[PDB]
C-alpha cells in the first residue's frame, strides 16, 4: 500500500519532460536575447536535447 | 524545546539561516532568500506532488 508501479509510458514521459526542460532553458534565453522579429519557431528549438 | 534550541529570531532571521545552511559560500539577500525558499517547496519548477 506504499509502493507503486511506474511503467514505460511514465518513465518515458519523465525523460521527455527532462528534454523539454533543457530545451526551454535554452530557448527562454534565446527569446529574451532574440530579436523576435525574423525568428521562426523552428529557429527557437533544436531537436538534439529531446 | 525547539524554541529553546532555535538561535534564529524572525522571518528575516529564518531566511538568513535557511540561505546560509542551504548554500554555504552564498550571501543572503532579502530579494534572493525568497527566490530560494519559494523554489524549494512552493514553485512548480521544483515541486509537484503527483
Amino acid at each position: 500500500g506504499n509502493r507503486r508501479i511506474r511503467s514505460v509510458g511514465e518513465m518515458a514521459e519523465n525523460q521527455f519532460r527532462v528534454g523539454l526542460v533543457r530545451v526551454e532553458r535554452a530557448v527562454k534565453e534565446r527569446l529574451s536575447l532574440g530579436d523576435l522579429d525574423t525568428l521562426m519557431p523552428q529557429d527557437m528549438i533544436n531537436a538534439k536535447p529531446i | 524545546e525547539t524554541l529553546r534550541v532555535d538561535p534564529t529570531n524572525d522571518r528575516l532571521s529564518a531566511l538568513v539561516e535557511i540561505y546560509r545552511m542551504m548554500r554555504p559560500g552564498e550571501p543572503p539577500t532579502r530579494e534572493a532568500a525568497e527566490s530560494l525558499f519559494e523554489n524549494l517547496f512552493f514553485s512548480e519548477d521544483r515541486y509537484d506532488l503527483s
Partner: protein, 153 residues
C-alpha cells in the same frame, strides 16, 4: 567610481559572456552601475575571465551571476569580490592600447593541400616573402614552393 571586477567565464564563450552581460544590464536597467566589460584580445592572451567596470551592490553581485556562463567574480571572499588595483587597470589599458626559415629546418605546411606534412627546407625564397620546402611525393624529395604563411615552426 566603478572599480573594475574580474569574473570567471566559460572559455570559448567569453564573447557571449560579455554580450550576455551587456544585454542584461540594460534589461535590468542597471546602466548606472556598469561601465564596460573588457575582453582584451590580440591578433585573447588568457581564454578565460572577463573584466567588468562595475560597482558593488548586492543587486549587482547577483546580477553578474545571473548572466549565463558566469560562475562569479574572483576575490578574497564570495561575500565581497574585490577590484583589481589602481595601476592594474592602467597596465591592462596600456597593453590593450599598445621566426626566419633556416636552411635544413623541418617544418609543416600551414595551409593548402600539403598542410600538416613532414617537410624539409631545400632553399631560401627570402626576398619574395615565399618559401620552398622539400616534400615526399612520388617517392622523391621533389622541389615544392609555397607561400610564407605556410610555415609551422
Amino acid at each position: 567610481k566603478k572599480r573594475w571586477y574580474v569574473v570567471q567565464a566559460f572559455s570559448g564563450f567569453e564573447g557571449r559572456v560579455a554580450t550576455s552581460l551587456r544585454e542584461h544590464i540594460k534589461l535590468h536597467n542597471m546602466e548606472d552601475l556598469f561601465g564596460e566589460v573588457m575582453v582584451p584580445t590580440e591578433e585573447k592572451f588568457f581564454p578565460g575571465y572577463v573584466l567588468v567596470q562595475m560597482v558593488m551592490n548586492d543587486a549587482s553581485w547577483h546580477l553578474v551571476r545571473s548572466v549565463p556562463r558566469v560562475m562569479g567574480f574572483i576575490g578574497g571572499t564570495s561575500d565581497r569580490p574585490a577590484p583589481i588595483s589602481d595601476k592594474e587597470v592602467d597596465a591592462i589599458m596600456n597593453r590593450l592600447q599598445q621566426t626566419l626559415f633556416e636552411p635544413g629546418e623541418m617544418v609543416r605546411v600551414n595551409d593548402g593541400p600539403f598542410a600538416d606534412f613532414n617537410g624539409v627546407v631545400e632553399e631560401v625564397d627570402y626576398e619574395k616573402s615565399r618559401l620552398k620546402v622539400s616534400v615526399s611525393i612520388f617517392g622523391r624529395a621533389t622541389p615544392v614552393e609555397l607561400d610564407f604563411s605556410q610555415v609551422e615552426k
